[PDB]
């Protein structure tokens, strides 16, 4: 004669609503439609107009961003190239900042 006991661990896994932006499992069909609203405008670089999942991800990018330099902080006005904006900052703001190396490149 004798006796004893035992145990075990649960587990959940089934149809889940993941985000088509960061692939994050939601809590419901509603969290998906909404999570997409914030996960779309969470982090938008005012330079290249990007869209990240978190606000930090952008903060870092802005530092290594290329459009940044092409962004007239003065009047927060971005441009297509440096030569183009330069004229806007040299003719209007008249800054005449340090222009880049000239080249035969196409314009
Ligand atoms: Zn997302
Ligand atoms: Zn950017
Ligand atoms: Zn300007």
Question: In terms of topology, how is this protein built?
Answer:
Elements lengths: L28 H13 L13 H10 L6 E2 L4 E2 L3 H10 L16
Antiparallel strand pairs: 1-2
Bound molecules: zinc ion (ZN) (3 copies).
One zinc ion (ZN) binds next to helix 2.
PDB class: metal binding protein
Keywords: zf-C2H2 domain, zinc binding, nucleic acid binding, structural genomics, RIKEN Structural Genomics/Proteomics Initiative, rsgi
Assembly: monomeric
Describe, in plain words, how this protein is organized in 3D:
By secondary structure, the chain is mainly alpha-helical. It folds into 3 domains: 12-42, Double Stranded RNA Binding Domain; 43-66, Classic Zinc Finger (Double Stranded RNA Binding Domain), CATH 3.30.160; 67-107, Classic Zinc Finger (Double Stranded RNA Binding Domain, 2-Layer Sandwich). Helices cover 31% and strands 4% of the residues. The chain has 3 helices and 2 strands. The protein has helices spanning 29-41, 55-64, 82-91; strands spanning 71-72, 77-78. The protein has a two-stranded antiparallel ribbon. A hairpin with a 4-residue loop joins strand 1 and strand 2 (77-78). The longest helix is centred in the N-terminal third of the chain and has 13 residues, at 29-41. It starts with 28 loop residues before the first helix and ends in a 16-residue tail after the last helix. One zinc ion (ZN) binds at residues 72, 74-75, 77, 88-89, 92-93. One zinc ion is lined by residues 19, 21-22, 24, 35, 39, 53.
Summarize the structure in short:
The PDB classes it as metal binding protein. The protein is mostly helical and 107 residues long.
């Amino acid at each position: 004669g004798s006796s004893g006991s035992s145990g075990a661990s649960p587990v959940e896994n089934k149809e889940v609503y993941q985000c088509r932006l960061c692939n994050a499992k939601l809590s419901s069909l509603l969290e998906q439609g909404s999570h997409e609203r914030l996960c779309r405008n969470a982090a938008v670089c005012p330079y290249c107009s990007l869209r990240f999942f978190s606000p930090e991800l952008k903060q870092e990018h802005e530092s290594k961003c290329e459009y940044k330099k092409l962004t007239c902080l003065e009047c927060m006005r971005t441009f297509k190239s440096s030569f183009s904006i330069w004229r806007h900052q040299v003719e209007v703001h008249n800054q005449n900042n340090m222009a880049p190396t000239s080249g035969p490149s196409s314009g």
